[PDB]
Nucleic acid binder design. Structure first.
Ligand SMILES: [Mg+2]
Ligand SMILES: [Zn+2]
Ligand SMILES: [Zn+2]
Lengths: 49, 75, 1327, 347
RNA sequence: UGGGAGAGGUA
DNA sequence: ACCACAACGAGTTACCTCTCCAAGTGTCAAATTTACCCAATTTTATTCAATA
DNA sequence: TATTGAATAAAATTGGGTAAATTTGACACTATAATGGGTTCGCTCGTTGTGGT
């Protein structure tokens, strides 16, 4: 219902297709926050396990 | 089961596991292309799943052995 | 998509170039002739990406045929414009510059890394003083900061043997030349020689920083920036305004300043500029980079043209309007509406009125899905124009979609969890939402202009969560206490009160009716009144010993209205709950009793029926308010004139000079308060019982049917204080400095006030109206602090398997029982059995959930102390067990594993902030010659044990207060034996004999002066400050001897019977007099919401209370100072422990008697850190629970104790290491108590010694900031400090908390996501 | 031009005027703010300055202020209050002389009124002379006490001296608790003008004063007879004694018709005089938005009943008849402006 | 496009 | 060691409503791309025949 | 009768480099005397970090 750009279009087409199921992903505001902490000279990164 | 969910809750034991089992059953009834075990009486699949849990035909192990049985039929 | 943890570290220059996509060189943002960004600028499309989707800049490859090519005319890669907000850049700074976070975020960590002062480091960075880096001679050791004079004469002395530099290059050379492991072993060597705790703490801080650097694996020279990264240009857009002009971004301005100064420094460096000019340019580049990273941190903030400081990257990360709190913890949300709310008095408890236009906008893709399922629309555009024209089949499909699809109604501020609830929507006309009247108490809603937000749950899991968890019929009981939140309010209450209330000769009295249906027939036909005292035949039911209902029938004596209410009372309840005049408390008790007897569904149906009949019969009552309803007592003029005569009498008494101003004004206050309560009692009597004119037995008194009195007495709306302001006297008002005025407002609101009385009342009016706003802000901040201190607490076990517990007791503080044991223990789980011979020898089993049945068992077996498993003594790591928590207060049964009890407890504590025979124990007594029991110990208290085995009265007798009765006898009612001296305390003896004034000389320790008030020449002692040279050694010890002169020997010891009497103590008895065992010789004379915030914040009091650290005998170590010294030595071991107590604080327990562990030796409020470290976790939890519940009970709110125990358990997460074992926990450092417990578990498992610890009571803010989740701590507060410490240490968040999984955007490990999270844990642990 | 336009456009005290009704305009113009350039700051101020000082009597109203975070910081001028030459507030008082309460009206500042002893406004008189009692109630040095009839130095000039304008338009204000009187005085400014204005049956007497002094009506400049009344123009032939010898003796009163206000309400003036009627100097010729015959008229008179009705008035809710809707009693006109500007793109 | 300030108001 | 000063941060939640935020033009050394030359490698077709 | 392990041209691809085109940032354009600046305080409460006896 918010900042998941590739998830909310999927949810809209799923509702029109009669399938009440979502496929959530990462928030674009969290990507914005990661880019800003990286721009502050601090290496933050998601860890693939 | 339209107003309250207390009979289904005393059937299962936990509202969170109730939500998960009834969501699995409502997925199978909505997009899985299945048919209910209770008369639907013009209800949504959510309330049909909750009425099935209240009557006592749908449980977690019931759904699991039903999925395993239909898996052995399709294989 | 698939990732476990989130790691943070410093950024190497190669890593900063690795994220980059091209160096930014020119500071131009965009050309303003044509809207095209300039090359190598801040918006350069060759660096960051094309401004159009699959189109180069110059317009050469505009199709998707070239999915990526570098257009050689303009260098632009033809891809999507989504990469503009993802590709970074970099700027290669000519001179290296210091990072402002790792310099001015205190503690600096560069100064802590190098053991250099921050003043010296800023002096180096500001190009003012040189610092040496290496030296071949012994005259210049490392980091010896030199001035310019010392640098020039050392240059003429040595020249090339040393090398001193300046600026950030010198500090980078120092950090690069330092040796990490060598400094580690040197600091671990130097730790042992020092002994002061300050120097030791400095050494542990430096060794923790060095070990954190080595264990993280970063390099210390990466704290000095040589490459600076650039934010992607779609995360700092150039928004165009309506004038054609631009409002350019602060980040674009700060990057422009940094790039301009860096380019000018490059030109001055390759131009061979003078050293002063190039140093000024380097300093300016340092200032610009520091401004861009954090404007307001170092100097004065660079302000824009609008005289406002520029927003930096730190300003975009931190704060309330920063990224975490404004866009990550809370977002704006689609499929959501908002409207003004109205009443829904026809609705049911699960229904809400949703407007048709609101629901048609909220449910539009569901409408498109039903339209394309029914085939009425060919495509999405046809369905869109059909909804745009609003066909009748569109409204029919909306009626089909709405049915059995719940929506969430929410009203801000959502203080507790019942601020969002789910309802089944009813499509209404109009534009306002219709709310059910019985949920407005849980919403804190009224209908004076409140608005609520609607939210549509989309997925099947969300619809099932709204139906099974958040439905309004599913939370009838509160989560804070077990009481129902669905209480009828004021109109239902007025209607049922008017229904059930009787009258003496109404109409159709004395009839005999067949039943409630005949009573309803009589009332609707008009042959009887609602209040006619009548005899009907009530068939009532009763549940048996099994679950079956037995019926019984009788002729009850009742009214007609109670018979009609019996038609809607369900089957299973008695007639005793209907057979009285029902007020608000009686209706709430009836609903709770119906719950406990029948369950949830009959309670919901019963609450609906109660609402319907209360509304209908309040309407049929026709109750009103007139000016003749507020009846003033006719003796108001007489009482007022008597009080005015009293004030005139005391006024002429003051004019006679007999009485002074202070006690005169106090007596005026007492006179007017006596007149106030007298006229209030007269008003209440006249309003309460004036309805007397009756018949059919005689003219007889009854309860008045005045409507103001009915609204007050029913508990509908009003109270006796407001009725007193309406009809009696307004009362004594106060000045804004907290002082009551001499004259009160002698008028009321029926007669009206004059101008002076109204202006007097406006002070308190505006004071209360400012306090409401201030307390909403303070309670909101307190609720946020509590939620963040308790966010990660979730029930993750069923039974931890412990024997620890909390000794529960009925609080009998003051002169009465405050909370009974039944509700103090109801719902808990017993730590062990109860063990007594008692009256029944009841043996409850271990680990039993105490229901109401077991509460009645303990009440009938007369138990007073039960040990129950608490939350602070749970054995579970990372969560609690279900047995240690107990009963789920919202559902009535045991708590399910996976429930966020920390968030429940924090909301339960932070919601009512807007409403904000004789028994002796611990005795050391002496009996004199008369048997007069005067106590000489300090912690002595008395109890009143009953005839059954329960204590019912508590009084702590002060040291020196007098008691007549002993022990063993039965107490007498009204016999207040407790009397005292309320201004002085004695120094009473214990051995009889003739007193000899030994160990003292007249003149230097004792002042010889005959007292002018008694006349007898008595010897007085003097203070130790003004003594002579002969008073600096000995202390005045009243060595009491027997009649012959020698000192007696106390049995059990060998010390002489001498007692050091303190200074400034008048001693009346002289030598040659007789003393008893227990007579004296000297008599020395003597908010709520901020209190809760201080108790949770662990703020030490302004005046502490010194406690005895070690048990033993107390002596003195140093004299001749007001800041004296006390030594307390045990009878077994040695003690070099000395304290420091000033003389302006009094001293409680003298230096002759042996004290115990952790008793008060200086009175005043106790500090909770001292209570913890001297008594225990159980004692500090009992102290905090009692001191918070005192505030919550003084304001009349009922919160359970397990919520405060949850918050204290979250407060006690840290354990400082007092002694190491075999693990790598060195000395004096704070670590998590679960880590110490797990290390001790595995060390005692594999056979090691294990480490010892000492738990620390952190505050709520400090614990929320010192949790081991840096993402949670940074989103709470102090993002600069938390991200700096986490970047230095190289931490990683494992995403175990609800705040972390909300920021990341996953399922929380609580509720329905708990099974998925433990499945993910077993998947990442098995494989 | 840059300095004065920066001030008059975007200062903190250059405020978008509230013009729902005439009361909102007059209260916004009679407003006093403790904030501003060189004043206080809103989040950084406590209960010490948000209190009602005893020197506020007759200068600053205690019951007209917002109830949000601006509560003690935004104030309203009292009715009779003036300023010094230096800018200090002062209020008029009647001077007594040997018990005789004269018509000597003295404007005293807050430092002068603590020296004297000022009698209350609600103390009786006879023949505009002495006081009918011998121990009247007064106030000196901020505190109140009883004083003798020859001890008294001054007396209040009116009984509406303490309150502001909007708190003086509340009838039976002395029976309302000060919290609800504050809320009602604030909510009087939010009233939308209706289709047909209706004078209140229970008013105060400040209605005509507000409706004339607000400048929203069209008062006559000179007295004479009315020559022509349209719905947009009133022509008055001036009487000869009020006529200058060089002019024609004709006054034209053009009226504003359906002008959008700042709050997107309606502003239109309707003529209240008829053809041929005489008017004097100071006579209302055209009504305002929410005036009626020169009297302020913010709402309508509704036949009300105080009873619970089936839960439809549950928690402050209101049940409304159908005659209210059919008779267009609370029907408001809301003019609203939408602009379409054709810009100059580079394509 | 849609950002940031300032002012006011509602619960 | 203990006290007395500086600096940071925090202060309810939404909601709304408004307004306001100078002129190219010719020249030089360096460094930067760019069309291109060429070995190492390796991917793909193509011959021999040899099992099947 | 056939399909395919080994072997081999052989041209395409990778990697490195390299001399010649080509950008790119700067600079010219010039001579009465001038020689050191303008910018926030009516906020509290608490906490933590710094310096003398
Ligand atoms: Mg309200
Ligand atoms: Zn191009
Ligand atoms: Zn436990």
């Amino acid at each position: 219902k918010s900042d998941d750009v590739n998830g909310r279009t999927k949810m809209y087409k799923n509702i029109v297709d009669g399938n009440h199921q979502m496929e959530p992903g990462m928030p674009e505001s969290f990507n914005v926050l990661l880019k800003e902490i990286r721009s502050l000279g601090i290496n933050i990164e998601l860890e693939d396990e | 089961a339209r107003v309250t969910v207390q009979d289904a809750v005393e059937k299962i034991g936990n509202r969170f596991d109730l939500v998960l089992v009834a969501a699995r059953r409502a997925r199978q009834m909505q997009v899985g292309g299945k048919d209910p075990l209770v008369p639907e009486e013009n209800d949504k699949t959510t309330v049909i799943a909750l009425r099935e849990i209240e009557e006592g035909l749908i449980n977690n192990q019931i759904l699991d052995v039903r999925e395993r049985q239909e898996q052995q039929e399709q294989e | 998509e698939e990732f476990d943890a989130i790691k943070i570290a410093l950024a190497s220059p190669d890593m900063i170039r690795s994220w980059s996509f091209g160096e930014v060189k020119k500071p131009e943002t965009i050309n303003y002739r044509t809207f095209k960004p300039e090359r190598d600028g801040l918006f350069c499309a060759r660096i960051f990406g094309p401004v159009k989707d699959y189109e180069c800049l110059c317009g050469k490859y505009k199709r998707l045929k070239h999915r990526g090519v570098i257009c050689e005319k303009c260098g632009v890669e033809v891809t999507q414009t989504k990469v503009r907000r993802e590709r970074m850049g970099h700027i290669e700074l000519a001179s290296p510059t210091a990072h402002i976070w790792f310099l001015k975020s205190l503690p600096s960590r560069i100064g802590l890394l190098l053991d250099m002062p921050l003043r010296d480091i800023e002096r180096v960075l500001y190009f003012e003083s040189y610092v040496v880096i290496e030296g071949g001679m012994t005259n210049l050791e490392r980091q010896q900061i030199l001035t310019e004079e010392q640098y020039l004469d050392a240059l003429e002395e040595f020249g090339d043997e040393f090398d001193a530099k300046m600026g950030a290059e010198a500090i980078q050379a120092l950090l690069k030349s330092m040796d990490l492991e060598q400094e580690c072993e040197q600091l671990r060597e130097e730790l042992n020689e020092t002994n002061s705790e300050t120097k030791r703490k400095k050494l542990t801080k430096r060794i923790k920083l060095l070990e954190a650097f080595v264990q993280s694996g970063n390099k210390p020279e990466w704290m000095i920036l040589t490459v600076l990264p650039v934010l992607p240009p779609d995360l700092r857009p150039l928004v165009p305004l309506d004038g054609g002009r631009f409002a350019t971004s602060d980040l674009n301005d700060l990057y422009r300043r940094v790039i301009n100064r860096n380019n000018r420094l490059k030109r001055l460096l390759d131009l061979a500029a003078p050293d002063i000019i190039v140093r000024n340019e380097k300093r300016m580049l340092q200032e610009a980079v520091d401004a861009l990273l954090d404007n307001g941190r170092r100097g004065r903030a660079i302000t824009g043209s609008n005289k406002r400081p520029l927003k930096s990257l730190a300003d975009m990360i931190k704060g309330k309007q920063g990224r975490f709190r404004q866009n990550l913890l809370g977002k704006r949300v689609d499929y959501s509406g908002r409207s003004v709310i109205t009443v829904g008095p026809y609705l049911r408890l699960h229904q809400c009125g949703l407007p048709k236009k609101m629901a048609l906008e909220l449910f539009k893709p569901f409408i498109y899905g039903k339209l394309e399922l029914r085939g009425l629309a060919t495509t999405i555009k046809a369905a869109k124009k059909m909804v745009e024209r609003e066909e009748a089949v569109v409204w029919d499909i909306l009626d089909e979609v709405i049915r059995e699809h719940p929506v969430l109604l929410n009203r801000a501020p959502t203080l507790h969890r019942l601020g969002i609830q789910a309802f089944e929507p009813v499509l209404i006309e109009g534009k306002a939402i219709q709310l059910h009247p019985l949920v407005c108490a849980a919403y804190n809603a009224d209908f004076d202009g409140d608005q609520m937000a609607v939210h549509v749950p989309l997925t099947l899991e969300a619809q099932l969560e709204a139906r099974a968890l958040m439905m309004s019929t599913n939370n009838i009981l509160s989560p804070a206490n077990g009481e129902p939140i669905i209480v009828p309010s004021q109109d239902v209450v007025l209607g049922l009160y008017y229904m059930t209330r009787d009258c003496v000769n109404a109409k159709g009295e004395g009839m005999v009716l067949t039943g409630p249906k005949e009573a309803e027939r009589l009332y609707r036909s008009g042959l009887a009144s609602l209040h006619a005292r009548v005899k009907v035949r009530i068939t009532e039911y009763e549940k048996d010993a099994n679950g079956e209902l037995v019926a019984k029938t009788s002729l009850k004596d009742t009214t007609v209205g109670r018979a009609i209410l019996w038609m809607i009372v369900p089957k299973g309840l008695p007639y005793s709950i209907v057979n009285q005049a029902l007020g608000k408390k009686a209706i709430s008790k009836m609903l709770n009793t119906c719950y406990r007897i029948l369950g949830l569904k009959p309670t919901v149906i019963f609450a609906d029926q109660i609402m319907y009949t209360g509304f209908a019969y309040a309407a049929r009552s026709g109750a009103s308010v007139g000016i003749d309803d507020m009846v003033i007592p006719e003796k108001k003029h007489e009482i007022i004139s008597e009080a005015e005569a009293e004030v005139a009498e005391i006024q002429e008494q003051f004019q006679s000079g007999l009485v002074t101003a202070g006690e005169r004004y106090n007596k005026v206050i007492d006179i007017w308060a006596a007149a106030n309560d007298r006229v209030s009692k007269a008003m209440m009597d006249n309003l309460q019982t004036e309805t007397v004119i009756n018949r059919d037995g005689q003219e007889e008194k009854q309860v008045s049917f005045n409507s103001i009195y009915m609204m007050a007495d029913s508990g509908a709306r009003g109270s006796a204080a407001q009725i007193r302001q309406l009809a009696g006297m307004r009362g004594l008002m106060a000045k804004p400095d907290g002082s009551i005025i001499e004259t009160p407002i002698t008028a009321n609101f029926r007669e009206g006030l004059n101008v002076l009385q109204y202006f007097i009342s406006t002070h308190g009016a505006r004071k209360g109206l400012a306090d409401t706003a201030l307390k909403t802000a303070n309670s909101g901040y307190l609720t946020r602090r509590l939620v963040d201190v308790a966010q990660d607490l979730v029930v993750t076990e069923d039974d931890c398997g412990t024997h620890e517990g909390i000794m529960m007791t009925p609080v009998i503080e003051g002169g009465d029982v405050k909370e009974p044991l039944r509700d103090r223990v109801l719902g808990r789980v017993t730590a062990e059995d109860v063990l007594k011979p008692g009256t029944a020898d009841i043996l409850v089993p271990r680990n039993t959930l105490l229901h109401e049945q077991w509460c009645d068992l303990l009440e009938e077996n007369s138990v007073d102390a039960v040990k129950v498993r608490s939350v602070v003594s749970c054995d579970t790591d990372f969560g609690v067990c279900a047995h240690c928590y107990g009963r789920d207060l919202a559902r009535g049964h045991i708590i399910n594993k996976g429930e966020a009890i920390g968030v429940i407890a924090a909301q339960s504590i932070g919601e009512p902030g807007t409403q904000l025979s004789i028994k002796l124990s611990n005795v050391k007594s002496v009996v004199n010659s008369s048997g007069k029991l005067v106590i000489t110990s300090r912690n002595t208290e008395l109890k009143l044990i009953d005839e059954f085995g329960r204590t019912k009265e508590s009084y702590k007798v002060p040291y020196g207060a007098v008691l007549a009765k002993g022990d063993g006898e039965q107490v007498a009612g009204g016999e207040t034996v407790a009397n005292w001296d309320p201004h002085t305390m004695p120094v009473i003896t214990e051995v009889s004999g003739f007193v000899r004034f030994t160990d003292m000389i007249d003149g230097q320790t004792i002042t010889r002066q005959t007292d002018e008030l008694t006349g007898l020449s008595s010897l007085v002692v003097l203070d130790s400050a003004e003594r002579t040279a002969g008073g600096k050694d000995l202390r005045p010890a009243l060595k009491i001897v027997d009649a012959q002169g020698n000192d007696v020997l106390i049995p059990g010891t060998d010390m002489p019977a001498q007692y050091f009497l303190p200074g400034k103590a008048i001693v009346q008895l002289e030598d040659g007099v007789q003393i008893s065992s227990g007579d004296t010789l000297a008599r020395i004379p003597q908010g709520g919401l901020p209190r809760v915030a201080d108790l949770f914040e662990a703020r030490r009091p302004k005046e502490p209370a010194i406690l005895a650290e070690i048990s033993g005998i107390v002596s003195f170590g140093k004299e001749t100072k007001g800041k004296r010294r006390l030594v307390i030595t045990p009878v077994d071991g040695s003690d070099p422990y000395e304290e420091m107590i000033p003389k302006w604080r009094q001293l409680n327990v003298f230096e002759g008697e042996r004290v115990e562990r952790g008793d008060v030796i200086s009175d005043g409020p106790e500090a909770p850190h001292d209570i913890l470290r001297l008594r225990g976790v159980h004692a500090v939890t009992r102290y905090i629970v009692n001191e918070v519940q005192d505030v919550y009970r003084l304001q009349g709110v009922k919160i359970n104790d397990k919520h405060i125990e949850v918050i204290v358990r979250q407060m006690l997460r840290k354990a400082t290491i007092v002694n190491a074992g075999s693990s790598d926990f060195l000395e004096g450092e704070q670590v998590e108590y679960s880590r110490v417990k797990i290390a001790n578990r595995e060390l005692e498992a594999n056979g090691k010694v294990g480490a010892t610890y000492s738990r620390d009571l952190l505050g709520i803010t400090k614990a929320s900031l010192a949790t081991e989740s840096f993402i949670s701590a940074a989103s709470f507060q102090e993002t600069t400090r938390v991200l700096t410490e986490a970047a230095v240490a190289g931490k990683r968040d494992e995403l175990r908390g609800l705040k972390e999984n909300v920021i990341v955007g996953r399922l929380i490990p609580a509720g329905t996501g708990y099974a998925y999270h433990q499945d993910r844990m077993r998947r990442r642990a098995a494989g | 031009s840059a300095a004065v336009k920066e001030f008059f456009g975007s200062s903190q005290l250059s405020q978008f005027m509230d013009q729902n009704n005439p009361l909102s305009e007059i209260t916004h113009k009679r407003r006093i703010s403790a904030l501003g350039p060189g004043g206080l700051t809103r989040e950084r101020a406590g209960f010490e300055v948000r209190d009602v000082h005893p020197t506020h009597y007759g200068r600053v109203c205690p019951i007209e202020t917002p109830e949000g975070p601006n509560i003690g910081l935004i104030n309203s001028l009292s009715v009779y209050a003036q300023t010094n030459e230096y800018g200090f507030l002062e209020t008029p008082y009647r001077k007594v002389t040997d018990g005789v309460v004269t018509d000597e009206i003295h404007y005293l500042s807050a430092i002068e009124e603590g020296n004297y002893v000022i009698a209350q406004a609600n103390s009786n008189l006879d023949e505009e002379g002495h006081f009918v009692e011998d121990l009247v109630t007064c106030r000196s040095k901020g505190e109140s006490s009883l004083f003798s009839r020859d001890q008294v130095d001054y007396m209040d000039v009116s009984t509406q001296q303490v309150v502001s304008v909007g708190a003086s338009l509340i009838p039976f204000l002395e029976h309302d608790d000060a919290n609800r009187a504050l809320m009602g005085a604030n909510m009087q400014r939010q009233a939308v003008p209706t289709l047909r204005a209706d004078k209140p049956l229970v008013g105060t007497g400040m209605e005509r004063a507000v409706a004339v002094d607000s400048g929203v009506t069209a008062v006559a400049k000179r007295g004479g007879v009315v020559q022509y009344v349209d719905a947009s123009r009133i022509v008055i032939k001036v009487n000869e004694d009020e006529m200058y010898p060089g002019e024609a003796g004709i006054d034209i009163y053009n009226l504003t018709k359906y002008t959008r206000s700042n709050q997107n309400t309606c502003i239109n003036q309707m003529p209240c005089v008829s053809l041929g009627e005489p008017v004097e100097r100071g006579d209302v010729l055209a009504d305002g938005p929410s005036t009626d015959l020169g009297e302020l008229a913010l709402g309508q008179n509704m036949r009300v009943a105080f009873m619970p009705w089936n839960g439809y008035n549950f928690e402050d809710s209101i049940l409304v008849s159908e005659r209210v809707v059919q008779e267009d009693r609370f029907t408001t006109i809301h003019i609203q402006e939408l602009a379409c500007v054709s810009r100059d793109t580079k394509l």
